[model samples]
Target chain A: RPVDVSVSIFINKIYGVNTLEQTYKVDGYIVAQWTGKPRKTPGDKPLIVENTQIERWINNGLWVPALEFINVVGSPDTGNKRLMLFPDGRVIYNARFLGSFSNDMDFRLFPFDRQQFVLELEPFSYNNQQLRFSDIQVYTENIDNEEIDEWWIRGKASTHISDIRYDHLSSVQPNQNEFSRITVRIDAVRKIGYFVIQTYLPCIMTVILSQVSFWLNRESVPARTVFGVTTVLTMTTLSISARNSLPKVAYATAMDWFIAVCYAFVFSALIEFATVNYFTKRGVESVSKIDRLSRIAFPLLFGIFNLVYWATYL
Target chain B: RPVDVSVSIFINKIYGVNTLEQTYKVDGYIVAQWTGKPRKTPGDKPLIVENTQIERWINNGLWVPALEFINVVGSPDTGNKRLMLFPDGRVIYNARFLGSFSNDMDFRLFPFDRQQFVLELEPFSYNNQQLRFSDIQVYTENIDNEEIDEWWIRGKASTHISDIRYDHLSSVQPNQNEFSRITVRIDAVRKIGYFVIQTYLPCIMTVILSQVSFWLNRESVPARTVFGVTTVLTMTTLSISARNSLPKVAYATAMDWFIAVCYAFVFSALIEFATVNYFTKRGVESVSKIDRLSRIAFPLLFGIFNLVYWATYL
Candidate 1:
């Protein structure tokens, strides 16, 4: 028998990925309701049922169960509770789910861009049987039409019948009755271009800043090494801060590899600067051709590499 | 309708685990055989069919598709495939698959313990179809098992029926199906006790070597910093080597945290040793209280910390 059903869905917030954990979190709510003719059961009085029992009743055809996610990843998080059907025709279900939003992200230059958040919803075990009407709405304070961090929402609340195929296990047979599953996707673009540009430019500039100590009086070893050490430490701290803002993953992002290469150049420059100062203190007769070329050529090459890397990324 | 079938699985190797990559690769083979009646389709000497159309025939009362895994994760990796149905009512399928095995592992002391590898397998889409009989044989190389620095293998297989419930989408009616998913777990214990004793014992004995720089009355800055620098570099290398065996993840394991702390201590020791020698060379009588305390006490504390940490893990 067909029934009238209504569903309410709420989406809370979306954040960046956790590279290390390889998982993301999405928080939301789902409320479902339907009206049915009340019928007396075996119990003399009204019986209040809970989680597992509610699902068990739904499985046994007490009342048709209708569940749908308006905005979620491949599926909604199956949070706390499931609904119960009163033999007499009233049914209600409320659940809160936290799930990972799946989407394709172009993270070639991660840490500098915002990743998209997608949610897909569909029934776990329903095939065009349990649902009648459905609707989904997202409520978030930060995403107004004019907000800078607004997300692009696509796809729609519709209906479909299909098999939920999992390519595992053999004794299991696909459910003949088409089960319903919902898929929802929400995407937010990040305004991280300026932040990325501002962050890296200073580190490169600081490396260039420390190079000033190189052309200074060759006798100043203490001053030069001190400046080099300070710059290196500062760069390390900056890398930490930038890394903290992004998801932790095993593979290096284009940004990480580029930053590391730049860091190596600065460290090599410091070593050379210190070596030159050490030679001067030893009363070395003359500067080697290698030292002179390195002093001029290293910084130029580093500057060019930085420009090339960033420009291509842009 | 039911179909009789037979299956065989051969597992080659389950080795690669990148602590930094959070991924592992698996390789294996699956063979399935059954018997079916000959059928004729219009316009073909022999009928050639694709995916969906084949399923359409199965749905419309054709011979039941009885594909099953002998020893598979919830699903086996489908490799190169060839299907043959003979005139004598015999059918056979042979394929090879290389998959990334997915399982939960708690690798707190990754480089020094037994780690379990797990595989999940299930039908692409089916339920309640019991597997007649199944067997999986893993072929691990004898050389790897005997090597001092390799993983020792252990195999255990299990099966279960699950009603994986999904709650999203309203189009399809919800119903529970008997789905069979296969779980294959291969575990290997690593013997790292010898490594711990072999690598760190020399470094610990070299603790007395550090005091040699103190005995040298020479006020050479390079001489003092060299010992500290060498120790720091050695420790840094050790930390990198230790991490080579694990997949990269954001949260640090007990081992990562420990190695990082050790590296910082060694680096700190080098900086202090360098700073003290620099000051003492100028005829300074007293070092900073922090520096003085650190040079005398830090090494002892660090040594004791390693002993405690390693002992606790063991």
Candidate 2:
């Protein structure tokens, strides 16, 4: 006989999404409730069994369907198992678990990126013919948004129950074996504060510093070169340091594009001095002309780059 | 009764060390052998139990000590369990496992870095008094050095069995119980081929190209400026792309020092042109003087940076 199970997941904490490891840690409670054959009870109250008594009932042939987290990497360490049995034949099992889950995450957009943390629950030993999901609920609490650090939850969590067919596992016929799967997705957005303070601000400052080299006297070769070289080195170091926190993906990110443009501006300032210094030897007329033009042109071009980069990615 | 068990690990494959996840995947076989009560058999010959029969013995109260991988994140999916029972008293258990192991890894040195992959084995429920490790042996195969890819194994793997004390565990006393642990360490070195081809070569080329600006005539202001800007921009791009493969660490790496020096050299070339161009308007003698000095001085300085950088890190 097919039995229906109502599942609810309470997310207590979510932290430590490791990009390189492609894993995330989740601490939460899993509650399963279903109806069994009606039994005689004392008064009209429910029967409660904690920890060791619950294990005793399970070993004594209680029909507790094996519910498993399909995406969990290993067997989760279950804590504080409890069972509530009602006079109307209802059974409830609640357990707390701290587990490391594996997920396929794309970090190309990085600080401006959005990702969904997924949880899949399915019957481990029984097929949909013997066990099915009635409905799955995901409950989450939102504190004031400002109090949250690193990642911000986008919206209320979403869930769905569907039958997944496995062709490879079926021995009788292809697509004959189907399992009920309850999928829960929590959408999240990475906070840009960390990247803005650590990466973008310093990068902007270095780019502006490179421009200062241009305002220096054309005859002051040592001062201009020193400023140009220092800014470039500092920016290069900053860019490399920023990338350390992120996973290595093949394509360029929005941050990558921004840093590239900043580097181009800094390098261009050095070249501009080169052009002005070169023309100074030929005649003072062209040197003054080029310098005058770049002072306004440099900032304007950088402004355009910012517009295009953000427009394309954001 | 205290049981002494000898353990041996035969590593079949080790791959996919995820930096962000702080996890590594290991595929290996674990062998546990110990003595049991002598049994009288009809033939007095050793009995071999494969897969299903071994599970039957375990269910029937066979004294099999539960050996667990301390660093494994979850329950490993065991493959092909085997048991050998000798009439005299000896018993052996062997099983194959593919598991994701968590480890604390420091990747600051990256491409020029050396790391150790570790495996920790301990009894799951029994302390050192009830169950103890006699010894552990690691069997590994060695190929010719040139045939290795990505990481090179440094030496033979080492193993040690020690008692690990737990302060937080044990109900009566803080450090009343201790567990026996078998720790294995295998040192490996990252190959620098990827960095040399992708980062070092391109950066060196750009630095050389910037030097061409030094040879150009001080009169050709446009040509010198354009060349200087192009080389600086290209080097910056190379540095950013190179960092994509590495983790973000706080400390400066060997590669960081090298790239910084390359940027300095290219920027210095642009400054050299500025110096010659400036003095040309002041006096012809000083213009020729600075030009001759930099042509020789630039290469000599870069060569010195190479000596110092390699000597400090390697």
**Cα RMSD to native, each candidate?**
15.9, 11.1
**Residue A83 of candidate 2: its Cα lDDT?**
87
Candidate 2 residue-wise lDDT, A211-245, digit = tens: 87766666556566666666766766676676656
Give one digit per residue, the lDDT tens place, for model 1 in A1-314. Answer: 43445655666555434443333566667666777778675674545566777645644445434343322222334667866546666676767777654344555466544454555454422234444445544454443344333233333323332234322212122333343444444444445555557567767776776676666655444466556555655555455455554433334566666656656776676667645644553455565555667768878888788788868755
Model 1 residue runs over 4 Å out of place are A1-62, A66-108, A128-163, A167-180, A193-202, A229-248, A274-299, B1-114, B117-314
Model 1 per-residue lDDT at A264: 70
Interface C-alpha RMSD per candidate, 1 decimal: 13.8, 9.7
Q: Which ten residues in a row have the lowest lDDT in candidate 1 chain B?
A: B44-53
Instruction: Report per-candidate DockQ.
Output: 0.04, 0.05
Tens-digit lDDT track of model 1 for B1-314: 33444554545445344434444555554555566776554443223222223355567765544444433334544433434334455555544565655556667665455666665555534443433223333333322343222355554433333334334322353454444444556666665532343234324423433443343223346545555665566566656755555666555766676666666666666666666656665555553565545546866787788788878766
| Local distance difference test values of all predictions, in order | 0.51, 0.72
Could you say which candidate leads in lDDT?
Answer: 2
